[PDB]
Design a protein around this ligand. Structure first.
Ligand SMILES: *[C@@H]1O[C@H](CO)[C@@H](O[C@@H]2O[C@H](CO)[C@@H](O)[C@H](O)[C@H]2NC(C)=O)[C@H](O)[C@H]1NC(C)=O
Ligand SMILES: *[C@@H]1O[C@H](CO)[C@@H](O[C@@H]2O[C@H](CO)[C@@H](O)[C@H](O)[C@H]2NC(C)=O)[C@H](O)[C@H]1NC(C)=O
Ligand SMILES: N[C@@H](CCP(=O)(O)C[C@@H](CCC(=O)O)C(=O)O)C(=O)O
Ligand SMILES: N[C@@H](CCP(=O)(O)C[C@@H](CCC(=O)O)C(=O)O)C(=O)O
Ligand SMILES: *[C@@H]1O[C@H](CO)[C@@H](O)[C@H](O)[C@H]1NC(C)=O
Ligand SMILES: *[C@@H]1O[C@H](CO)[C@@H](O)[C@H](O)[C@H]1NC(C)=O
Ligand SMILES: *[C@@H]1O[C@H](CO)[C@@H](O)[C@H](O)[C@H]1NC(C)=O
Ligand SMILES: *[C@@H]1O[C@H](CO)[C@@H](O)[C@H](O)[C@H]1NC(C)=O
Ligand SMILES: *[C@@H]1O[C@H](CO)[C@@H](O)[C@H](O)[C@H]1NC(C)=O
Ligand SMILES: *[C@@H]1O[C@H](CO)[C@@H](O)[C@H](O)[C@H]1NC(C)=O
Ligand SMILES: [Ca+2]
Ligand SMILES: [Ca+2]
Ligand SMILES: [Cl-]
Ligand SMILES: [Cl-]
Ligand SMILES: [Zn+2]
Ligand SMILES: [Zn+2]
Ligand SMILES: [Zn+2]
Ligand SMILES: [Zn+2]
Lengths: 690, 690
């Protein structure tokens, strides 16, 4: 088959060669090297035989350290004397000059000074525990939080809400140092001198902070920088664990409340505020990063469909990194090139797809999904009426245990089908499929005989396509074993030590695991773009809605008396879900009857398949979040990396027992139950024959 | 042709018989008689042979007088003694019991007392003149305004902003008494005892006040009534001119400022506050209408398409009236029945349309477009992806001089084409077409060789379809001669005197003018639903955008120094308009080349024609107005009946010289210029081939 030709043409050695070629120098967004990498990708797509390959630019707010006013944290004594201050490229890269020092992009500027408080992971539950159980008031304090568990911008939002005047982020070995592995370069663990870069915005889907809603073109209106969406109002800076140990060692005050607050350093993990047993009197931060409008460049290419050129499947991945980014994103950049090359080989033998493929290399993803979101804002009118699906191509290889897939229920069946026809790259599975190894290693909690597929929140460039525009989206990559590996992300994430050599020595020396991910991403694009009937299954969406309705109802049971007292009922939601299940079953019964030789009959049913995900989009958005529009899924308000189901109801019920005004609070729950019931009923209505 | 069979089957005598049958009794929304009229329309559509005809209900907030606490206005002396108080069915209707007394639906309740001020038509410019030129402060006053010029809800919003505590509305003979015509029943003029009913909400497109965004179903969340959208916060009541003359006669204070403030009554038109020359000391209002959730019923029917059943042309008109409503809306109800009957006659000979026709009889239009807007909110997901156009069928006969058409530029060419093939009903034009008489009587200001077509604002049930959803819309009716007839609406508008006998004796005894309107509305539906290529012209939209851009730029010239000082430029708007004109020309050049025997080629271009109007819809809405989403048109903020072009820019520049903060004000102008330029460029992008 053509799909087998596409998959079998892809080669591990080619992914390895692309990865080495793209990882020799840092390629930070807005810098000359990441522009040169765009032009290189463009040249390659033209050689492969794509119909077009263009650079598409935007001018967006970025953030960088000031070379002549360096950031630091210090400890001062009562006489204002600095007692301590926080502070080469990896082997082989000694001549690389322009590695950006560690910083958190979009931190406020300032020099706050105060007592230090340790706040664990700075999650919502950690600040609840501090205030409600531990007697700690963070107002006016500098807080120190360990990285991990949730997106760092959520930590900063939480510290702002708790009244902190600054937040120090650090990498604790409990979370970034795998047991019995040596630090880089001898092993793949994080050294104590390395800090994790990353932005600390709270954009909620907005894209460029200065141009929410509209693409950042040269004529475009810009908000004043002080009103930029999502920009934090306190300083934020990241440090490695050698420096963190010095800051934590003499913290006094209360003992850590339980073992879940204690990391792995040889310190007490006492909470503060203040020091004991030391010259250590106050902590200071000094953070002076600069925000500036900077040009970014997406590469956008196409293969135009031969039958339905006005229908799109998008394969997009980011190219910008914090330093070399050999895993994030460049492993995905290398995969995207190998998929485009393979589609080019098909074209060289006369094939053309039924629908149009759009290939995209996004810029400034690490600064808030900026390039992919600005392009979605520019092209929203054609994208929302014509797109079948978005397949991401970020990091392919964050661990070497098994596959991880996150996607809409519409795509579950296609994912399972395609993984059965891709050889497993895993040791011990040499005559078995990827589906077989994935099922053995990560069975789904809700059905032991299927592999786990996760919900979509945010974290990568599919966000605007799925959460704002309602385009079916999916992602797949290799990952760690969650039952034995307790570290967050991977140890060297967003450090200088994400090098080609790390990937080849420690993650995937044969490049077979990366190859399996390229084969799956490419095969998904192929089936979505070439199949006469779009390969979605809406009965799988109906089953998912039944599970999500049971989950949100279960989370309401502990408030049963309040539900009765305030007249709150989930009956309309369960009725809408029942009606959707009936409509989805009836739709599939009619779909198998379609006359495949009648092009308008086929197109009308394909439009229903394409527009189903769109029915879940509410133009009014979610509360406070104009740009999260999907009623079934949104990024969690507590952790943008995680997807939450029925987000409007979930947020309305969360911590409701502590709301000041219970009558108002329960009316908000009733509002969002009503919106969810309407939206699912409306979606069911789009499937009806008459 | 089939179109000629549709048009020629329609008969004046049938429109007359329908109108007589629907106008014997009042048919106020939410009352038993208007439900009985729905079931009658349903029975008729089934007899005609429609595929379906269903009642679709919603429970929405309506407003009615309290039978046991009647409304009134009084004049009291300084001893609190009532000196004056404001206060049968038409001939032939003496036994009709349930005529609703005059009131303004959704008025606040209250009994304010104070000095009286005359505020002319209570337009924005009248309140500017009062405050800025005449030295009058309306704070704490009862104001009296004449009806006319603008929607009455705008008068009430303006009086609230000026600080009034109540507003009396009245019909001045200057505006509702045509010269040398006798009052009803001897002629068609307004008697001095009659008052005009009508709602006084400021909904801005929201629909039911309690359920903005979502259809008002039985499970639906409802706002608390005190938070209902658009509900005024002062009492409002309407009176006839015999009563108004008594209230105006002894007003003292300043003389009317110029003749444009003087109506036709034998009173001075002095402004107040206060009385002179009289026992007349203070005015009181007493208004106690009740707001209550009430069931309403739309009738929705279909003829399913034979080729593209998933594409819709909607023909909708309201059925509810204030009293008998023989003009508004029942002349349009009679027309809609005659069009449905004629389509049924086509079906009886074996015809079926290419696309689907949706017929709708809307309820509660007179209470804020409620039935049509709730149905749009219920069906938004299918409507926005599948609708070709909306054709209204409200009043057909508001005067007897010539045609009036209001529609999107997409429909100009079709309107002109069809009017050339409909016989003119006008005396003296017996061998000429309707186009010929319309052109002679109402030439367009921008092209003397075409009839005038107006922009769409609000005022009838097309509003949500066009302004919220971006579905091409049009309306047509017979109207008065504006160059000789200076009265607003028609004299008996919204009174008990809108009777069948009024229409037959004074407006259109032969029913030929009503017939010509039925023929045009039906022919528009037919061509939109049956033509292989949707009959829109996008180069006419390009020309319209050039005119609107020149108009908004011209309105900015008096601020030229401020444009320079604040760095405001219209360059991006003119560049987007140029790019749209090029894209529209290129689209039409490709459209004539389409292979008409290739169904997917045809469908792809029809999708571009259908989705063009949608490209102008911004889900973020206009400032303060979530439900007006069209960037090119919106109802005027000063008069919802009028359409305004580039509404976001217009409102940003309006009265800008009086804004407190000029830097902020000009930044808002720049924002809305940027949004308009983006939106037109995005719309141009939807026409591109690649
Ligand atoms: C699911 O579909 C059913 C059947 O159409 C809807 O049930 C109606 O519910 C209303 C109250 O909302 C009752 O007045 C009707 O009598 C019901 N008809 C039946 C049971 O045949 C139900 O409303 C739909 N669910 C939603 C959320 O729209
Ligand atoms: C209309 O189309 C033109 C041509 O594509 C656009 O012109 C570009 O304008 C930008 C500044 O916005 C310049 O950087 C380019 O050099 C222009 N290219 C030309 C003139 O070939 C113009 O931006 C479009 N208008 C809008 C509103 O998008
Ligand atoms: N592991 C995460 C993050 C991958 P990422 O590319 O590194 C994204 C980047 C920006 C996110 C944002 O601004 O919203 C960040 O998390 O710092 C995932 O896969 O989902
Ligand atoms: N002459 C006007 C009004 C016709 P209408 O049907 O009477 C509408 C009705 C309700 C309007 C509203 O609530 O927005 C009103 O104006 O009071 C027109 O044609 O456009
Ligand atoms: C960088 O810091 C130096 C020293 O404070 C300052 O003079 C300079 O203005 C800064 N650069 C920017 C772009 O703010
Ligand atoms: C938090 O501490 C600050 C100290 O300035 C104080 O204003 C506030 O009342 C305290 N709140 C709680 C819950 O202790
Ligand atoms: C890669 O897999 C090998 C073999 O199972 C294992 O020893 C190594 O730890 C894995 N690497 C990482 C980075 O997990
Ligand atoms: C009508 O007015 C009477 C007299 O004030 C009052 O008792 C009654 O409650 C009113 N009806 C409603 C529905 O408010
Ligand atoms: C309007 O009159 C009221 C009288 O109470 C007063 O509060 C306000 O200052 C006056 N404003 C103007 C512009 O005269
Ligand atoms: C109807 O037309 C006749 C003949 O021109 C005219 O005398 C009469 O005033 C018109 N009626 C109205 C209501 O305008
Ligand atoms: Ca933007
Ligand atoms: Ca509603
Ligand atoms: Cl990915
Ligand atoms: Cl109309
Ligand atoms: Zn990253
Ligand atoms: Zn990434
Ligand atoms: Zn009316
Ligand atoms: Zn009407």
């Amino acid at each position: 088959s053509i799909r087998w030709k596409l998959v079998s043409e892809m080669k591990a050695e080619n992914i390895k060669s692309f990865l080495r070629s793209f990882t020799k120098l840092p390629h930070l967004a807005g810098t000359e090297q990441n522009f040169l990498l765009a032009k290189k990708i463009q040249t390659q797509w033209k050689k492969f035989g794509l119909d077009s390959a263009k650079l598409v630019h935007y001018d967006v707010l970025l953030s960088y350290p000031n070379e002549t006013n360096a950031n630091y944290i210090s400890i001062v004594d009562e006489h204002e004397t600095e007692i301590f201050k926080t502070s080469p490229p990896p082997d082989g890269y000694e001549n690389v000059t322009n590695i950006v020092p560690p910083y958190n992009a979009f931190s406020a500027q300032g020099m706050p000074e105060g007592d230090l408080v340790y706040v664990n992971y700075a999650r919502t539950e950690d600040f609840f525990k501090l205030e409600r159980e531990m007697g700690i008031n963070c107002t006016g304090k500098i807080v120190i939080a360990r990285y991990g568990k949730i997106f760092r911008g959520n930590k900063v939002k939480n510290a702002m809400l708790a009244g902190a005047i600054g937040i120090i982020l650090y990498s604790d070995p409990a979370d970034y140092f795998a047991p019995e592995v040596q630090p880089y370069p001898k092993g793949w663990n994080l050294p104590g001198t390395a800090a994790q870069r990353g932005n600390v915005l709270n954009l909620n889907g907005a894209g460029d902070p200065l141009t929410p809603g509209y693409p950042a073109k040269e004529y475009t209106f810009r908000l004043d920088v002080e009103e930029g969406v999502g920009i934090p109002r306190i300083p934020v800076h990241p440090i490695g664990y050698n420096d963190a140990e010095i800051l934590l060692r003499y913290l006094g005050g209360i003992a850590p409340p339980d073992k879940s607050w204690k990391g792995a350093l040889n310190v007490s993990y006492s909470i503060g505020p203040g020091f004991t047993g030391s010259s250590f009197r106050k902590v200071r931060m000094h953070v002076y990063n600069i925000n500036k409008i900077t040009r970014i460049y997406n590469v956008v290419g196409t293969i135009r469909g031969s039958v339905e050129p006005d229908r799109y499947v998008i394969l997009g991945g980011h190219r910008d990194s914090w330093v070399f980014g050999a895993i994030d994103p460049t492993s995905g950049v290398a995969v995207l090139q190998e998929i485009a090359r393979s589609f080019g080989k098909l074209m060289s033998k006369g094939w053309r797809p039924r629908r149009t493929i759009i290939f995209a290399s996004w810029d400034a993803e690490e600064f808030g999904l900026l390039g992919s979101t600005e392009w979605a804002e520019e092209n929203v009118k054609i994208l929302q009426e014509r797109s079948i699906a978005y397949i991401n191509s970020d990091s392919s290889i964050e661990g070497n245990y098994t596959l991880r897939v996150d996607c809409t229920p519409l795509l579950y069946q296609l994912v399972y089908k395609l993984t059965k026809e891709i050889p497993s790259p895993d040791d011990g599975f040499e005559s078995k499929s990827l589906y077989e190894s994935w099922l053995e290693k990560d069975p789904s909690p809700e059905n032991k005989n299927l592999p786990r597929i996760n919900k979509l929140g945010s974290g990568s460039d599919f966000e605007a396509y799925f959460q704002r525009l309602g385009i079916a989206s999916g992602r797949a990559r290799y990952t760690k074993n969650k039952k034995t590996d307790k570290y967050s992300s991977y140890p060297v994430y967003h450090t200088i030590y994400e090098t080609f050599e790390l990937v080849e020595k420690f993650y995937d020396p044969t490049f077979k695991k990366q190859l399996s991910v390229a084969q799956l991403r490419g095969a998904l694009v192929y089936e979505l773009v070439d199949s006469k009937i779009i390969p979605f299954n809406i009965q799988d969406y109906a089953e998912a809605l039944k599970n999500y309705a049971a989950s949100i109802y279960n989370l309401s049971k502990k408030h049963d008396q309040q539900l009765t007292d305030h007249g709150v009922s989930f009956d309309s939601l369960f009725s809408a879900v029942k009606n959707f299940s009936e409509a989805a079953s009836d739709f599939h019964k009619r779909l198998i009857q379609v006359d495949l030789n009648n092009p308008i009959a086929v197109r009308m049913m394909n439009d229903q398949l394409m527009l189903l995900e769109r029915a879940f989009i509410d133009p009014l958005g979610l509360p406070g979040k104009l740009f999260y529009r999907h009623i079934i899924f949104a990024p969690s308000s507590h952790n943008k990396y995680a997807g939450e189901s029925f987000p409007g109801i979930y947020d309305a019920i969360f911590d409701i027992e502590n709301k000041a005004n219970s009558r108002l609070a329960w009316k908000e729950v009733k509002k969002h139950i009503s919106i969810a019931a309407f939206t699912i009923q409306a979606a069911a209505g789009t499937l009806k024959e008459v």
